[PDB]
Structure formats: C-alpha cells, structure tokens
Amino acid sequence: RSPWQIQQAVLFALFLRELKTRLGGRWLGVFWVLLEPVAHIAVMTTLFSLAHRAAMPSIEYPVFLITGLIPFFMFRGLVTRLMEAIDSNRGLFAYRQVKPIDTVIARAMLEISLQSIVYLIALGTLGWLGFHFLPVRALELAGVSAVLIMLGASLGLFFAVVTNEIPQARAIVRISLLPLYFVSGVIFPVHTIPPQYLPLLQLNPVLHLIELSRASFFPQYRVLQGINLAYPAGFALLSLFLALMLYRLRRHQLA
Amino acid sequence: LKLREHFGTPLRDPLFRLWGGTSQEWFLEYYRSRVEVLMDDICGLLTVR
Structure with missing residues (x-):
C-alpha cells in the first residue's frame, strides 16, 4: 500500500488504543476532564473577584478565566501527553509500521x-448563564489558537525526543508546567504587574498568545506594549524545526 | 424619533428587524442590542456606537 495509507491506519489504531487508556475502563475520565476547569474557576471566584473588579470592571471573571484557562490547559495537556509517549507504547514498536x-x-x-x-461545552454553558460568550474576532482567535497548538505540539515532541536518555529530567518538566500557570496571566490580568517585571515576562510566548487570544475574544481589550504575534510565531517555528530535525537525528535510537 | 417605525423598515431579512406588535421588554432588549456603550477605564472615556 501507499505509505500515507499505512500511516493513516497506524494513527487510527493508535488513537483507538490511546482513547481507552486516557479516558478509562468505565470512561470515568469524562467525569474529571469536564470537571477539570470548573474546579479551578470556582475557587478563584472566592479569591480575587473583587480584586479583579477593582483592576478591570469592563469584563468579568467567569469569562476572563475561561478565555485563558482551557487554552492553557490544552497546551499543558499536549505537552504532558506527548512527553509521556514512546515509552507507554514501547512494547508496540514491534510491527515495523508503528514509528x-x-x-x-x-x-x-x-x-x-x-x-x-x-x-x-464551556462556551455553551457560559452562554446558558447569560454571560458574554460569543467571540468578537473569531478568525484571529482561531489563528492564535493554531499558533499555540503548533508551539505546544513542538515542545511536546522536543521534550519526548530529548528525554529518552534521561527520564528523570522529564519529571521536572512537568513541575515546570506549574509556574507557567502562575506567570502566563491566566488567573489574574497582567496589567497589574509592576513595569520593571514585565520585560522579563515578555520572553514567554504563552503569555503573548494568551493576551492575543483574550484581545481577539473580548470587545475593547487592550494589549500591552511589546506583546505581538511575530515573536511567538517565530519561537514556535524554530522550536518545531529543531524538534523535527532532532527526531530525524535520533530516529533509530528511540525504536 | 420613532425608533419603532425605523427599525421595522427592512422586510428583506427577518433576523435583525423589529417585528410589529412586539413586547416592551423585547423592544428594550433590541434597543440595548443596537446601541453599544463601552467605557475605557484608564482614561474613563465613554464611547457610544
């Protein structure tokens, strides 16, 4: 058969195998992932709701949190699940078609x-409660989300390839996902950060992508100076090229 | 200004026109939809579209 058809069939079989383990024997995982963001949002309604209203009263926490949580959760899930690959299918590398x-x-x-x-589902249930849920510039939001997808998949592939020799360095990477959630401006608006601290944070492309997604979502959402799409796009492109080339280098070591 | 007469003029589309004989609450919601007010907090400027 053609190589594309073989790759497609292998990907379909791997997806079918991975769905059962990711979700669960009784699919209890759907009771968790659906409850995954809500458990985060509710506590922040009891922590900085009034602080956020003092900071910016134009928008509301139930939508501001959602606009930055699920994209970050999805980036983190991409990175983590792609990092734990290869090993979890190490026994399946025995058929010459599973790469x-x-x-x-x-x-x-x-x-x-x-x-x-x-x-x-989150947008539907937010619109059910009467909150603002329809994006203003949907195409720009889709583009920023695609850039975030590419960056996350690139980082996951790079970490999966580079951690093959050193498994322990994998674990700290998961730990390294925790501070980003606190420094990407997901929980709180970054306009409150003191000016001398922002330029160090500008090197984080996830912060730029989250800010641009929020700008494309909400009507009249301001963007701080130094926030752009060119830097995250170049970071994602360079990281993807390097990760693919490194996988090409160690193509046979993993197998 | 007879807003009710004006907003019911375009019969071409049934989605963005004010149908005749509608409730007062629906009229208020339609008016709130067709008049957008935003406030810029840092300068405190009110923009009306």
Whole structure:
C-alpha cells in the first residue's frame, strides 16, 4: 500500500488504543476532564473577584478565566501527553509500521479533540448563564489558537525526543508546567504587574498568545506594549524545526 | 424619533428587524442590542456606537 495509507491506519489504531487508556475502563475520565476547569474557576471566584473588579470592571471573571484557562490547559495537556509517549507504547514498536512519531501524533489528535469539546461545552454553558460568550474576532482567535497548538505540539515532541536518555529530567518538566500557570496571566490580568517585571515576562510566548487570544475574544481589550504575534510565531517555528530535525537525528535510537 | 417605525423598515431579512406588535421588554432588549456603550477605564472615556 501507499505509505500515507499505512500511516493513516497506524494513527487510527493508535488513537483507538490511546482513547481507552486516557479516558478509562468505565470512561470515568469524562467525569474529571469536564470537571477539570470548573474546579479551578470556582475557587478563584472566592479569591480575587473583587480584586479583579477593582483592576478591570469592563469584563468579568467567569469569562476572563475561561478565555485563558482551557487554552492553557490544552497546551499543558499536549505537552504532558506527548512527553509521556514512546515509552507507554514501547512494547508496540514491534510491527515495523508503528514509528515513535505516530504515538505523539495520535496523542496530539486525542488531546486536541478532547480540549475542543471542552471549549465548546464551556462556551455553551457560559452562554446558558447569560454571560458574554460569543467571540468578537473569531478568525484571529482561531489563528492564535493554531499558533499555540503548533508551539505546544513542538515542545511536546522536543521534550519526548530529548528525554529518552534521561527520564528523570522529564519529571521536572512537568513541575515546570506549574509556574507557567502562575506567570502566563491566566488567573489574574497582567496589567497589574509592576513595569520593571514585565520585560522579563515578555520572553514567554504563552503569555503573548494568551493576551492575543483574550484581545481577539473580548470587545475593547487592550494589549500591552511589546506583546505581538511575530515573536511567538517565530519561537514556535524554530522550536518545531529543531524538534523535527532532532527526531530525524535520533530516529533509530528511540525504536 | 420613532425608533419603532425605523427599525421595522427592512422586510428583506427577518433576523435583525423589529417585528410589529412586539413586547416592551423585547423592544428594550433590541434597543440595548443596537446601541453599544463601552467605557475605557484608564482614561474613563465613554464611547457610544
């Protein structure tokens, strides 16, 4: 058969295998992932609701939090699940058609589908409660989301390839996902950060992508100086090229 | 200004026109939809579209 058809069949089989383990034997995971963002939002309604209203009263926490949480959750899920690949299918590398890239690709499709479903459900239930839920500039939001998808998949592939020799360095990477949630401006608006602290944070492309997504979502949402799309786009492109080339280098070591 | 007469003029589309004989609450919601007010807090400027 053609190589494309073989790759497509392998990806479909890997997706079918991965869905059962990711979700659960009784699919109890849907009771968690759907409850995944809500458990985060509610406590922040009891922490900085009045502080956020003092900071910016134009928008509301139930929508501001959602506009930055699920994209960050989906980036984090992409990175984590793609990093744990290869090893979890190490016994399946015995059929000459299952290559290490296919596992991370299939996990990427699964995570993207799950998080897109979560986004749709969250927007539907936010519009059910009367909150503002329709994006203003949908095309720009889709473009920024695609850039975030590419950056997350690139980082996941790079970390999966580079951690093959050193498994322990994998674990701290997961730990390194925790501070980003606190420094990407997801929980609180970054306009309150003191000016001498922002230029160090400008090197984080996830912050730029979250800010641009929020700007494309809300009507009249301001963007701080130094926030652009060119820097995250170049970072994602360079990281993806390097990750693909490194996987090409160690194509046989993983197998 | 007879807003009710004006907003019911275009019969071409049934989605963005004020149908005849509608409730007062629906009229208020339609008016709130067709008049957007935003406030810029840092300068405190009110923009009306």
